[model samples]
Target: GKAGLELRNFYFNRDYRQPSQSYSEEWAQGFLLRYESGYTEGLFGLGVDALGLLGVRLDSSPERSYSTSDRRAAHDYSSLGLTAKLRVSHSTLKIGTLMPRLPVVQFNDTRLHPQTFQGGLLEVNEIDGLALQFGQLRQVKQRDSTNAEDLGITRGNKRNVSDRFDFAGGTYRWSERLSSSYHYANLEDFYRQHHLGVQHLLPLADDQSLKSDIRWARSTDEGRVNNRALNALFTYRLGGHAFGLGYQRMSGDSGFAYLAGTDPYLVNFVQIGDFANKDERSWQLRYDYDFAAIGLPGLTFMSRYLRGEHIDLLDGGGRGKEWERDTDIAYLVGPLKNLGIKLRNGTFRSDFGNDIDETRLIVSYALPLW
Candidate 1:
């Protein structure tokens, strides 16, 4: 039904405060070309979608290959993805390479290119204010990987693991200002996790509002390392400015568990870390502004600071402390609004881990074809 070409140029650099650690650096260009076909006429509707992704390395080395997740960066890499869809009544089934944005699982799109999962998903929305989703994902292609691998955690433990991951979840909007969700997921032979969330908003005026979001997750190992976490955030917005505060904590035998090549849905998740370590408790303060209200229609700024205490280091050496501060700015350009630019900077320091500084510059453009 529509088509578009995505263009991106990114430069990344991270420096370790400790001299013992090598710095990270990378420059790359990426693109995504996508097209979709509409459903056919019948009791059951059908459609097909296609995606093409390619990346070209600008400059990198063994010491600078963090962007590609390899000791040596490749000159270029590319992949083709497709999806087939069927719809009946208010239900839809999708198969092929999936980029799902569900409650418990979602591919990482913050990197050079989005990750994809090879699997099937079925979602039903037959009732108003309610949505139900179920998925079976067997394999995943990471944002930087040109090849696909079985579903499992990529780092830590380094266990040769399960080939299947299953998840089921949904959200219900009880009213205009309130919603709740429940989700359950299991990675075969690893962990079984459950999530519960509630969100509420109160409007003070036509231009002002207050929002409260609370999310909790409990994980039990199918095979010992169970985990429990709670993250809560509250924000107040007036005009074009917003201020927010967050608290996140973890308990039990381990840290938060989540899928690889993805991002956690916790409120304390940042560009550098999730603040999800075992026994970790963290607090955050954030501010955001939209320049559109002040005559700049396409500019925005956001910054946040988080400090965590009582962490059980994965590397082991007793408990420790860590903190992170991050800043981001974005602007869209041209009369056509096709060009976009973003900058991100962060500082991370920890008692047991290496301290570091991080920066990323990205330029993006969208070429639309209908």
Candidate 2:
């Protein structure tokens, strides 16, 4: 067996004007561990992988809603979990607890800590350009809950629960320059979802190329899962410049779709007014440039604009309206090999939202442990 470990540190700060115009800041640290074994020689290839996680909260306050467990001082917080994985040829099956990264429901590590889930899963890669997967997840953990009931998507206000989440997908390469993929999922007692994605790379005569990407998803209602959405994301890359455009629509009984728990899977296809919408519509535009064209190899620039509208009021039960706009800039540099530095600033505004401004910074260095 081979063992590996990583030291990951993080800091997070958010100004959430909730209930009243108040906010707070918080930070945490995490340690990750992994171990794997070479498959035993047999007709059926057999191997196993193990993952361990530990999280420690460092700071938080009452005014700003930084912590999920209501542990104000950040001192009384800790959590641990593990996963057992099996593989046969190119296919693998995992059980116990882990992070699930499905298009419809994604486990995220955007905060100081990551969200984890408890479930049974399988993934098959019988072909070079294709992957098939299925899973049934029962519980999930949020970034803040290291000690209590943390596996959920939404709590506090309403109780939306699901017994199982099952999914499968495939990716196909039509040609050397074109690829497409599709996915389907069912959250028993919640909803059923389908997703499709396409991408193409076209070469021009003048040493240039264009790349385009598009994705869409549809969901069937179950209990409170009456929200369905379609999204299109496109990107064009030529030499040193890249341009992107995206459009998203929520056209159903609710604004967006969910899996019945707050498992840190809220960013994908999610708008500011996603939870409350008779029908939500959003559009985004972005541009990026690589400084390598100007001799600054590690420098880059990016800017984007996103707008969302048509929100159904929570109190009105689908008769309200709302919209939001967001813009941001980020810079990253590797001062030295295996070391990185990043800084970002952004502005968010909406007819009804929290925190109009935000900023983030990170510096990290990694070394291989072989």
Candidate 3:
């Protein structure tokens, strides 16, 4: 319960630049109540964690909420999650509802209710500077759905869905400014993948540093999920400003494989587009600034532009291309404790897909309860 109550009010608006469906818009509010019981006094400690999530549709209509035709946003929705945990020394075992955030299976948290999975996880931290984890997820509760269902690839025909997914990995802190990790994943009989990542931060001065993050993943399967991807991001931070450059490449007969609606680990994954189609190559340019250094605390801004080319279309066609520009501004209110406000805008254009212009306005408050 130490995390407290979380509340958010959000308005999402997206307009298709040229299409049959002109717009998709909605207003919603969400509540999250998380409670965690401390381990009982004993060698084999036991605890229980609970999550109560509630969502209310403030403004939605069949005409405006046609992301899924004829399926308008419900007036209200809710789901409860509970985790049974056991701790032995530096290792912990947890079963039941989970929100796994690993590279192999990430939980999507961009919208109301987020997403959840029914699974089990084991974490071991016996060794200093090293952390290990293993998990198997069985069912998934999507961001907008109250019902849990089977899992499958996000973008393709669901001819082969899986009810079981297993992943194992760990992270090792090699030094004060460097870290490395490797993970193995198997989504039942459908696909298998290996992931490797390295991150390093180089200190240039008291208030300056250079950061590099590189990630690689190769997925193979008897089915249609076959791909290899390499993504890297480098940034230089000076004072309150940061400049970043990133690149991503995908190969193989298919696109990058992932669970439906997950926040992938790819560096170029952005608000409206993944740019992750087969053989797609992308580049990014980003800028960020924090106003705190100028005596205006709690205010920040970011903007990024990305272009993707050589996309391999599912339907046999010429090479595809896409580009997106995104911007975000956030401010924390000092008058109202724990009040945060964010505005986001994205514009995307694609050669083989629909072009979209989207904006989001969100107001949130998080309170800690002892």
By TM-score, how accurate is candidate 1? 0.93
Least lDDT summed over 10 consecutive residues: which range in candidate 2? Answer: 152-161
lDDT of 2 at 93: 82
RMSD of each: 3.3, 4.4, 2.9
**Candidate 3 clashing pairs, residues 3+ apart or interchain:** 1-36
Worst 10 residues of 1 by lDDT: 61-70
Shift in Å, residue 237, candidate 1:
0.8
Which candidate tops lDDT?
A: 3
What TM-score does each of the candidates earn? 0.93, 0.81, 0.94
List the candidates ranked by TM-score, beginning with the highest.
3, 1, 2
Regions of candidate 2 where Cα sits further than 4 Å from its true position: 1-4, 62-72, 76-80, 147-161, 205-207, 260-277, 314-336, 353-355
Model 3, poorest ten-residue lDDT window?
Answer: 61-70
Residue 235 CA displacement from its true place in model 2, Å: 1.3
